[PDB]
Amino acid sequence: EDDWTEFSSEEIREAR
Amino acid sequence: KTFKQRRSFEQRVEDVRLIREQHPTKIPVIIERYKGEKQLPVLDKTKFLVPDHVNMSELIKIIRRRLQLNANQAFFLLVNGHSMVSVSTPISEVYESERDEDGFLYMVYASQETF
Ligand SMILES: [Zn+2]
Ligand SMILES: [Zn+2]
Ligand SMILES: [Zn+2]
Ligand SMILES: [Zn+2]
């Protein structure tokens, strides 16, 4: 229940 | 109740101030579902920090993968209540031109291009 959600590099790479 | 209704103006400006003390190049983005949208699911989280160099197609592809949308589903982002930018645009330029008076970048999503 913490508000700030950062995208990992894993997640960002997998987009591309 | 939306993010703006939950947190006060004073509190939202403080949030942004605090988070950019820690991450001076990352973009504080509020992502919510358009009030009229029924097909797409509400996101688990509202507050996102995204790197400066991520573009809008990359951002939409992230959110699609989070929501496991099947390929045929449409996904559109409306920024600051009016702006549908080119998907080639980095999110840092969007923040430059479209951030809110509180320091957050507000977006809403839907599966229809009208809003
Ligand atoms: Zn993974
Ligand atoms: Zn510090
Ligand atoms: Zn505009
Ligand atoms: Zn610029």
CATH of the domain at B21: 3.10.20.90
- DSSP annotation of B55 reads B
Of the partner residues A4, A12, A16, the one whose CB lies closest to the CB of residue B19: A4
Distance A1 CA to ligand 3 centre (A): 33
Q: In the numeric block, which tokens belong to residue B8?
A: 């006060």
Technique that determined the structure: X-ray
Number of domains forming the structure of chain B: 1
Is the CA virtual torsion B52, B54, B57, B63 positive or negative? Answer: negative
CA-closest candidate to residue B54, choices A5, A7, A4, A3: A7
Identify the H or E element spanning B107: strand B105-110
Beta bridge partners of A6: B49
Q: Are B113 and B76 in contact (CB under 8 A)?
A: yes
CA-closest candidate to residue B62, choices A4, A5, A7: A7
CA distance B105 to B98: 7
Count of residues making up chain A = 16
Is the CA virtual torsion B41, B30, B75, B60 positive or negative? Answer: negative
Record: contact A11-B50, CB cut-off 8 A: no
Record: contact B45-A3, CB cut-off 8 A: yes
Record: contact A6-B48, CB cut-off 8 A: yes
User: How many CA within 13 A on the CB side of residue B81?
Assistant: 3
Burial group, residue B115, by CB count within 10 angstroms (0-12, 13-18, 19+) = middle
CA distance B115 to B113: 7
Residues of chain B in Cβ contact (below 8 Å) with chain A: 19, 26, 45-51, 54, 58, 61-62, 65
Q: In the numeric block, which tokens belong to residue B60?
A: 């939409």
Resolution of the model in angstroms: 2.6
CA distance A6 to B26: 9
Q: Which domain holds residue B14?
A: 1-115
CA-closest candidate to residue A4, choices B45, B7, B20, B75: B45
Of the partner residues B45, B51, B54, the one whose CB lies closest to the CB of residue A5: B45
CA distance B48 to B39: 22
Q: B17-32 b/e with 16+ CB inside 10 Å = b?
A: eebeeeeeebbbbbbb
